[PDB]
Design a protein around this ligand. Structure first.
Ligand SMILES: Nc1nc2c(ncn2[C@@H]2O[C@H](COP(=O)(O)CP(=O)(O)OP(=O)(O)O)[C@@H](O)[C@H]2O)c(=O)[nH]1
Ligand SMILES: Nc1nc2c(ncn2[C@@H]2O[C@H](COP(=O)(O)OP(=O)(O)OP(=O)(O)O)[C@@H](O)[C@H]2O)c(=O)[nH]1
Ligand SMILES: Nc1nc2c(ncn2[C@@H]2O[C@H](COP(=O)(O)OP(=O)(O)OP(=O)(O)O)[C@@H](O)[C@H]2O)c(=O)[nH]1
Ligand SMILES: [Mg+2]
Ligand SMILES: [Mg+2]
Ligand SMILES: [Mg+2]
Lengths: 430, 426, 249, 428
């Protein structure tokens, strides 16, 4: 009677979903074939004989990644209809994903959503996973979220995107995709959690002591954060925080709902022995600038509202003590119109570690979400990228060839400028 | 006779009420199954105050439980002493109110409110002489605040000639686990003033201070704080259940404590609170209790009584004591601290002695002080409100449920009115 | 006190009428010239000063002079109404946007936005390096404050800025030491019978325009009036050494 | 509750830290791997499962010595991140350590000092170990000390430096580095403890009868002194002397805080059999000129303030009799304005002996700290050395080319002139 359904679009979304469903199957004891050897009800449906079906919809205009999942070790987990595939990729083109190649598939996915949301009694929202840089993760997510917003007006949708990094990048037309997706991510979703690859690369290089990390480690970290978010819905603790509660706690004004996530303690199995990892230590580890998963310095901003989802062996007195020492510090600057800025939540289930991965089996962990004003830097850089390319009209002919109109490029830019201006004008004193 | 209906709303209220029922049942000698294995006939004489007899000779609490999320019903029923309640008195919703006053009072609570009135009506029309009601809730929230306010308004509209006793846990500045507390607190206490006869402002900061300082506990969980609150609760209404040399029901306390109609917000206390190590270094006599009650480090509301005179004080003693002792002690307490009492009240202390003490003690006492310092506890909240409402922060979530902006100004205006009325007598 | 435009542009009705009421009140003759300029059918179009461009041949002291004459040409504001709202704690990139739009519009300028303009102009030269200086002073039973922009090109200290007075806002690169510069400012301040009380020095500004580093103003602060000038000079020279070696952080 | 964090900088600092931490591990019973088979709280932190981590921060701009610690026999003790390294040393150059190579590493160490200080409920002070001759142990310690003074303005910092010797030296630009380091060690410190290598070599040649000593013996003796200073925080005794009580009774004026340590009885394992080692004898031995660990002559100067930290089998009556006998001696010349200048402390913990060391199992020991005026001469000689080189501007092009300026040399020298004038001023 408390549920949310997951949609994974594009290569990045599907590949993160792989790690996510590995983690969820591990936490509740579900075998890879879906057979258990009532907390699973949030993410799994029981269909007689103990078969567990995830509430997932895997979608990709290109069939190679979905085929990789179909042939992988979880072929028996999902039922086959959920894994939807196109014929040819969007090819890093927003206009192919949204207009040309998205039309032929969108109905075939929407009805599937209409099926899944008709099986559950109480539904809390959606967990959409995508990437900004791609042509699928931008255009197809735009189409899907528009359709859902006109369909289900009052169901929260949580995007978990992957924003492009400042320097590290793997495509030439990323700014054009991200600026075009800024319109859908605003005004349709309810809480978008930006993430970068460069920040997690630094975290794996420094904390975990891995010189050559690949995408699997990043996917595992993001899966840990999402499993921490959707933890009060599955287990029980001293304080419980569902979706709408932390939505009311975080979002001050309707148009600024872009928190940046954090996690702690991320440590290798070797350094664990020399560490105590008390509540105060992990609570202080969340606020240092060397742990943010967006390549931006939080010291050049202020925190509007914060949310500290604890889990494991924690008690509220320690949390109050740690929050007190945080409030004493002058480096951590809060905003004057938010005299109380912490939404605490404690859970009894400790973190789970995947066997193939590299993370210490710690006894308590905290997930920190912050609606800080430092996020604008992560946007501002990207605008400059757009400004450098659109001045020469470079690559625009590819987009206008697929039916897209040119004025939308300037409309998206002015929308993004308005978003940055609104995000900056709050946070001023008094 | 003089039976009491008990209601509980929200997680905090439900947990405190569960502990209260454990304490009461242990006091009366009631099996967890609801059967009676007592020893003294005084336990069974006034069992009807809180319990209903049921066929097979078992006792069911006269309790009603409500929440908008069904998890707390599961936790309460699964926990100890969870099977005594009648299942049909449970009332649950689809999902919680997040933390939204307008959601638990206008949109999502208005649909469930009819069931709670219906079960309350059935419980109250299945008795002969009803004294009043008792609710537990928290001001800083959506369910316990909004639903509780709606419930008391409806019940008072339906029973003008009864009394209420809301044991509300106010929000404190230091320990804070929510971002929109001032809005909810102001919106609720706007309606508690006019729709209630007594309100006992408990606070979590003062409770934690009691655990660390007096009890000397390493890891105080919510169980300990709920146990202290339950001890106060059982102390307040003991005279309705046991005989005493000088007894006082709820209405006697109401007409003694309250000089003027708006001034009914109390601050409780309890003694003897002693650590495990320091059991043997005390005499356990009336002087010790009287000194411990009036200690400023023993009030359950995080206020300093030294910054305000006591309008009126009560002390419901519990045990086998002499009465000359109590009178001389609570006379010289007033004379010694005359600067901390009101000049235009000739006597500020109403005593009451009951023979039967708590189970694990030889004697005890419950302090119920109507101090004028309580304005501070509200003043801070008002400041926080003005910090947020100046910029309308987090406000669209409340307007989205059909709640206008002028309600906030009305509640704040009334809040300042009450604080001014309390400050007027200093 | 002078008020600040905050409606972006154009100027809204409220600030418009407020400024006109202010200037009507303070001007002793008042309504005559005010109404004449309001109801003037035709007025001379002011010219647009052209932003100078850096050239390698011409020397750097002449560059600072050139920026100073452009700033002088921009008709220092004494209308008593700020036109471009500035925040001290705001990240630098916002101040660069403010500087470039201000150059585009070319309106009257006060000391704070003058030093911001100086930073914007001099941002293109790694050899040049600049920082802020502030004074809190006492005169006629009231405290006042002033801000200027110091420069440390070619191992020499110089100063730029703005003021209603003449010699308090411009010095050349002719100072061996920062102490000589600040004591010259103190002597010029004494020349108006104004007593300096406190002096504040910040940090070298980064040369990257599109960055979020805020501007520091209070990294060093002294009460100049109380203490004898020898200790002031010693502490200041220590601080200058600490700055030019980039040690301070 | 009573905690200090020690910082070791440069090769000399790290190599003395090796001996210090071996000594503390032997003192409190901790094994080399950290597992004990509540006095440890001053230096160690328990981390669950009975594993104790030191409160240490090893620093160096070259990974050659810290690498030996990492691969040495104490690899499992220190936290792996505490050991901080660079890529290229300071190269006996002050400016390379204070300006160029030091600025790329200071943040990584200040973050860890902050992380360690957060774990302390009540912090007493710091213990910085370094050497004056080096470029790392001068420039980097100057940088770190400035930053710590700005951050932790209240805690007291106790230096333990290895001052250059008069004759024996292993570097050509020691005077420059020392004169540059003196500003930081005078401005930001609280009690700088100077040491010479020639003095300790002579001590081992005479008392211990070791004809061919090396740096291990010197570091072991210095470590024994440091263990004697911080004994009152860890153990208990009749008269306890913590760091602030210690600092008072020794610092009469804010700048006169350069005492010089001593120790007794230091003897071979065989010579102890014939020697009585009563309290009077060790007290007299502490005051002889042949046991000072600075190559200096105390007979040509007066003791301003003194402090005798005893430990082992002692009782106050013998201490009082010994001090009375000392005060009547004519060679022991005290200053007039200090009618009493003996602070006394006693502990019940006798000294420990490392298994591989050449020291006797004594029954009672004394650490003798003195704020005498003779140490001016120990500085004066070094100033003479500076005067010989700076006249020719020899070796100055390295310093100016690395980033530093030229006036710093002149102002450091004038500051030393001022310091020597101040030391000569008192005792008149
Ligand atoms: N003595 C106790 N205090 C509690 C307990 N639970 C909460 N509190 C306090 O209650 C405060 C908020 O109360 P609630 O979370 O119950 C608000 P409520 O659940 O009634 O509305 P919803 O969130 O819509 O469910 C919280 O900050 C805690 O400090 C408890 O079990 N015992
Ligand atoms: N964290 C993470 N990021 C990924 C992963 N795979 C791709 N990305 C990011 O995705 C961005 C490129 O967009 P894609 O998601 O690959 O585009 P797409 O969704 O496949 O859509 P098409 O281009 O039409 O195929 C790159 O900048 C990567 O940073 C992954 O496995 N993990
Ligand atoms: N007593 C003692 N002195 C030492 C030891 N190691 C080095 N020294 C002294 O340190 C002085 C030079 O300082 P170093 O430590 O070698 O230089 P540094 O501090 O490492 O700085 P760099 O030269 O940049 O590496 C020499 O004169 C030595 O006498 C030691 O283990 N014990
Ligand atoms: Mg693809
Ligand atoms: Mg709840
Ligand atoms: Mg070296």
């Amino acid at each position: 009677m408390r549920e949310c359904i997951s949609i994974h679009v594009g290569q990045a979304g599907v590949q993160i979903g792989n790690a996510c469903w590995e983690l969820y199957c591990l936490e509740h004891g579900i075998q890879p074939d879906g057979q258990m050897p009532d907390s699973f009800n949030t993410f799994f449906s029981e269909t007689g004989a103990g078969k567990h079906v995830p509430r997932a919809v895997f979608v990709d205009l290109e069939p190679t990644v979905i085929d990789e999942v179909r042939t992988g070790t979880y072929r028996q987990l999902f039922h086959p209809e959920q894994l939807i595939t196109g014929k040819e990729d969007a090819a890093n083109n927003y206009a192919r994903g949204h207009y040309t190649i998205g039309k032929e598939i969108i109905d075939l996915v929407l009805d599937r959503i209409r099926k899944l949301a008709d099986q559950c009694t109480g539904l809390q929202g959606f967990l959409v996973f995508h990437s900004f840089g791609g042509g699928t993760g931008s255009g197809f997510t735009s189409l899907l979220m528009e359709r859902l917003s006109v369909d289900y007006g009052k169901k929260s949708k949580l995007e978990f995107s992957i924003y492009p990094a400042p320097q590290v990048s793997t495509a030439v037309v990323e700014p054009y995709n991200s600026i075009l997706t800024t319109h859908t991510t605003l005004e349709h979703s309810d809480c978008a959690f930006m993430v970068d690859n460069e920040a997690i690369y630094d975290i794996c290089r420094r904390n975990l002591d891995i010189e050559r990390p690949t995408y699997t480690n990043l996917n595992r970290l993001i899966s840990q954060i999402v499993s921490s978010i959707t933890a009060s819905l599955r287990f029980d603790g001293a304080l419980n925080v569902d979706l709408t509660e932390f939505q009311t706690n975080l979002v001050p004004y309707p148009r600024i709902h872009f928190p940046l996530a954090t996690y702690a303690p991320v440590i290798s199995a070797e350094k664990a022995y020399h560490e105590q990892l008390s509540v105060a230590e992990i609570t202080n580890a969340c606020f240092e600038p060397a742990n943010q998963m967006v390549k931006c310095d939080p010291r050049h901003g202020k925190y509007m509202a914060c949310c500290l989802l604890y889990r494991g062996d924690v008690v509220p007195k320690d949390v109050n003590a740690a929050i007190a020492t945080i409030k004493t510090k002058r480096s951590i600057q809060f905003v004057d119109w938010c005299p109380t800025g912490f939404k605490v939540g404690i859970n009894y289930q400790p973190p789970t570690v995947v066997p193939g991965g590299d993370l210490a089996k710690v006894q308590r962990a905290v997930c920190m979400l912050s609606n800080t004003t430092a996020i604008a830097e992560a946007w501002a850089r990207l605008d400059h990228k757009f400004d450098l390319m659109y001045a020469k009209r470079a690559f625009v002919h590819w987009y206008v060839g697929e039916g897209m109109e040119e004025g939308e490029f300037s409309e998206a830019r002015e929308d993004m400028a308005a978003l940055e201006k609104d995000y900056e004008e709050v946070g001023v004193d008094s | 006779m003089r039976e009491i209906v008990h209601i509980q709303a929200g997680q905090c209220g439900n947990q405190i009420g569960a502990k209260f029922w454990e304490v009461i049942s242990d006091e009366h000698g009631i099996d967890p199954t609801g059967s009676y294995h007592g020893d003294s006939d005084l336990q069974l004489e006034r069992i009807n105050v809180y319990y209903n007899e049921a066929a097979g000779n078992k006792y069911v609490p006269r309790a009603i439980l409500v929440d908008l999320e069904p998890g707390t019903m599961d936790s309460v029923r699964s926990g100890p002493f969870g099977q005594i309640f009648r299942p049909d008195n449970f009332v649950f919703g689809q999902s919680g109110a997040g933390n939204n006053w307008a959601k638990g009072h206008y949109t999502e609570g208005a649909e469930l409110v009819d069931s709670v009135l219906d079960v309350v009506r059935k419980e109250s029309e299945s008795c002969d002489c009803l004294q009043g009601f008792q609710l537990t809730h928290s001001l800083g929230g959506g369910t316990g605040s909004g639903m509780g306010t709606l419930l008391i308004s409806k019940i008072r509209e339906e029973y003008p000639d009864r009394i209420m006793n809301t044991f509300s846990v106010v929000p404190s500045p230091k320990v804070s686990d929510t971002v929109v507390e001032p809005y909810n607190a102001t919106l609720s206490v706007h309606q508690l003033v006019e729709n209630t006869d007594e309100t006992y402002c408990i606070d979590n900061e003062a409770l934690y201070d009691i655990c660390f300082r007096t009890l000397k506990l390493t890891t105080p969980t919510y169980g300990d704080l709920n146990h202290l609150v339950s001890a106060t609760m059982s102390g307040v209404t003991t005279c309705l259940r046991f005989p005493g040399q000088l007894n006082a029901d709820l209405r006697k306390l109401a007409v003694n404590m309250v000089p003027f109609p708006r001034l009914h917000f109390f601050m409780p206390g309890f003694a003897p609170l002693t650590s495990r190590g320091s059991q043997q270094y005390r005499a356990l006599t009336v002087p010790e209790l009287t000194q411990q009650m009036f200690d400023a480090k023993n009030m359950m509301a995080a206020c300093d009584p030294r910054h305000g005179r006591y309008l009126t004080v009560a002390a419901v003693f519990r045990g086998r004591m002499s009465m000359k002792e109590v009178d001389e002690q609570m006379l010289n307490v007033q004379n010694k601290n005359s600067s901390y009492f009101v000049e235009w009240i000739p006597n500020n202390v109403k005593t009451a002695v009951c023979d039967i003490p708590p189970r694990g003690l030889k004697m005890s006492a419950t302090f119920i002080g109507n101090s004028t310092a309580i304005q501070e506890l509200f003043k801070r909240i008002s400041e926080q409100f003005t910090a947020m409402f100046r910029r309308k922060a987090f406000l669209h979530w409340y307007t989205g449920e059909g709640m206008d902006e002028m309600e906030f100004t009305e509640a704040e205006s009334n809040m300042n009115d009450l604080v001014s009325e309390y400050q007027q007598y200093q | 006190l002078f008020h600040v435009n905050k409606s972006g542009f154009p100027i809204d009705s409220h600030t418009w009428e407020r400024m006109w009421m202010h200037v009507a009140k303070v001007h002793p003759k008042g309504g005559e010239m005010v109404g004449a300029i309001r109801n003037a059918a035709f007025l001379a179009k002011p010219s647009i000063p052209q932003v100078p461009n850096y050239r390698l041949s011409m020397t750097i002291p002449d560059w600072l002079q050139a920026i100073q004459n452009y700033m002088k040409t921009l008709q220092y504001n004494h209308t008593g109404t700020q036109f471009f709202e500035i925040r001290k704690m705001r990240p630098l990139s916002g101040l660069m946007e403010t500087a470039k739009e201000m150059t585009r519009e070319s309106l009257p300028i006060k000391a704070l936005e003058a030093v911001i303009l100086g930073i914007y102009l001099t941002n293109g030269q790694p050899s040049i390096e600049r920082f802020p200086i502030s004074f809190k002073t006492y005169f006629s039973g009231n405290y006042f404050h002033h801000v200027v922009l110091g420069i440390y090109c070619n191992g020499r200290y110089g100063s730029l800025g703005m003021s209603r007075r003449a010699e308090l806002m411009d010095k050349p690169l002719t100072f061996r030491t920062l102490s000589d510069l600040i004591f010259d400012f103190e002597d010029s301040y004494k020349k108006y019978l104004h007593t300096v009380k406190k002096v504040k020095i910040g940090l070298y500004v980064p040369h990257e325009p599109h960055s979020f580093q805020p501007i520091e103003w209070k990294q060093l602060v002294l009460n100049v009036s109380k203490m004898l000038r020898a200790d002031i000079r010693k502490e200041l020279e220590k601080y200058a050494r600490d700055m030019r070696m980039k040690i301070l952080k």
